[PDB]
Each structure stands twice: as structure tokens, then as C-alpha cells.
Amino acid sequence: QTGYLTIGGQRYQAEINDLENLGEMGSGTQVWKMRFRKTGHVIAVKQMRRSGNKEENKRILMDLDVVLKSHDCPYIVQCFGTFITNTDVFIAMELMGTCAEKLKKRMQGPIPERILGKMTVAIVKALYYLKEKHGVIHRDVKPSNILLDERGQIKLCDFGISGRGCAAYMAPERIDPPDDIRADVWSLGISLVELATGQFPYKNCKTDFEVLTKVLQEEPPLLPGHMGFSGDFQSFVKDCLTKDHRKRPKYNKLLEHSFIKRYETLEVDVASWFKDVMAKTE
Numbered sequence: 001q002t003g004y005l006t007i008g009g010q011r012y013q014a015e016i017n018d019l020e021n022l023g024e025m026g027s028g029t030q031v032w033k034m035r036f037r038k039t040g041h042v043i044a045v046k047q048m049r050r051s052g053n054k055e056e057n058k059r060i061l062m063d064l065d066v067v068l069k070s071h072d073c074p075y076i077v078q079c080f081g082t083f084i085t086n087t088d089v090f091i092a093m094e095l096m097g098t099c100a101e102k103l104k105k106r107m108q109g110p111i112p113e114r115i116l117g118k119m120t121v122a123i124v125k126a127l128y129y130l131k132e133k134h135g136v137i138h139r140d141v142k143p144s145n146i147l148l149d150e151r152g153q154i155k156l157c158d159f160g161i162s163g164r165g166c167a168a169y170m171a172p173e174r175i176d177p178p179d180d181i182r183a184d185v186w187s188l189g190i191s192l193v194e195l196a197t198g199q200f201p202y203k204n205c206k207t208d209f210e211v212l213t214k215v216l217q218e219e220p221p222l223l224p225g226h227m228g229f230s231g232d233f234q235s236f237v238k239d240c241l242t243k244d245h246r247k248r249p250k251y252n253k254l255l256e257h258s259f260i261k262r263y264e265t266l267e268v269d270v271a272s273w274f275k276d277v278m279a280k281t282e
């Protein structure tokens, strides 16, 4: 079903001209920021040109296939609807604030652990939902694929390489495979260290292959102990950053980790902290 926008619990018969274009948005690719004239809702609309790249359009249709069937997951970016015109296809995604990568740039420093705790519970349950409900492997987990908004929500972005990735967050066994959902556990751990310290773990790398050598030759980059990080946080990163993929835990035991169980029940106001950081901007 296309041509219908479903914001909240109301379905509106919409058209491409019923959306007011408010300009394009900067993200990993063509997503527009639009305003539904009949309701006033600001939504994200990515436009897939019919005469576009067949390889890029294939990646757009792959993630939409996963996004559409991920409606019962609260940690995946939702699709409000689709518009199939004669020359274009418009996918209406929900509008969020920014990604963890750009949030790292505006912060110009580390991200608090209490914010990464809610983020950790969100991304793990999002990846676990993909492996169980649809057998989907993200294979490209990185801060650029972790969205946030004013309401304090944290969600997963888009899986254009998902199967039933960036070389900077690639798992050790993805570089030298013997003879795999645990590959994203490493990518998540590398993303956590980058956000918890404000610096990429494998620095001073001018080549993608040089990053691959440091993953295999050097020890996994754990969290520093002089920043006040909790023991449960350091235990979660150390478990996620296990070089031997056979010893790295799956999402089942990751959910049973004490660091996850803390921020499932803890009340962390991600909404107020998000508005304060975005206020200080260039």
C-alpha cells in the first residue's frame, strides 16, 4: 500500500504535492525534509529517481523492505508511507534530530555514559530484532547509523547492505575469515569507544588497509580507566571487542549483561540532554 502517510495512529491520503519541500538533509546517501500540508508534520522523504543508479536503487529498496516489516520494533527508523509517481518513488521516513557521528562533532568531546547506556540498549535490541524476527544482519554498524531526536529516542538507520560495511568498524574475522551476527558486535564496540572518548580508536591511519592491520595486530581498544567509566561499561566493551569471533558473545548473552540490565530500568532524560547539546552549535 502506497500513497498513504501514517503518522502516529492516523492514516492520511497523501500525494507528492501534499508535501512541502523544506530542503535536503545531509546524511549517507537523496533524503528531503518535508512538511505535510494537511497536518503540519515535518517528515523525512528520501527520493529514489527512476533513472538513478541501479546499484544505489537496489540498496534503497533493500532497506525499505526491512524498514516496512520492522514496524513492531521501537529502535528502527519507521516509514510513514510511500509515493510511487511516474518518474520517482518517495519513501516517507520519520524525522529525527541527527546521528551519533554528527553529535560527536558538535559535542567536540566525549558522550556521557548515561546517554551511551540508553544507546547501547537500543542498538542491541535493534540488531537482535533483525537476527530473530527476520534473520537480517546489519553488517555496517557505526555512529552514522544511530539516530536521535528531541524526545530522547535512539533508533537504527538503514541497512543497504543487510543480508538474510565500513572498513573502520569491520570485525577481525571479516578481514581474515576462517573457513555471522557477532561481526556487528565488534562494530558496535568500536563505535562505543569512539563516542565514549571522542576519538576514533585506530587513529593516525591514512589508509583503509592500515586500519585493518591495527585490528589484527594490536589489542582491542578498550575504554580508559581514568575517565570514571563504570565497571559494567568497561566489561561490556571488553566483551564486544573480543578478537576471536568464536569467543565473542551473541546478542542473547549481551542482553543478559549487567550493563544492559542497568539502563533498561534506569530513568535517563535523553530528551533534555539532547536539546542542550544541539543548542551550542556553530
Ligand SMILES: *CCC(=O)Nc1cc(C(=O)NCc2cn(C3CCC3)nn2)cc(-c2n[nH]c3ccccc23)c1
Pocket (backbone or CB within 6 Å): 025, 026, 027, 028, 031, 033, 042, 044, 077, 093, 094, 095, 096, 097, 098, 099, 100, 101, 102, 143, 144, 145, 147, 157
Ligand atoms: C548521520 C547524519 C544524519 O543522521 N543526518 C540526519 C539529519 C537530519 C536532520 O538534520 N533533520 C532536520 C531536523 C529538523 N528538526 C526539527 C524541525 C522541526 C523538527 N529536527 N531535525 C535528519 C535525519 C534523519 N531523520 N530521520 C531520518 C530517517 C532516515 C534517514 C535520516 C533521517 C538524519
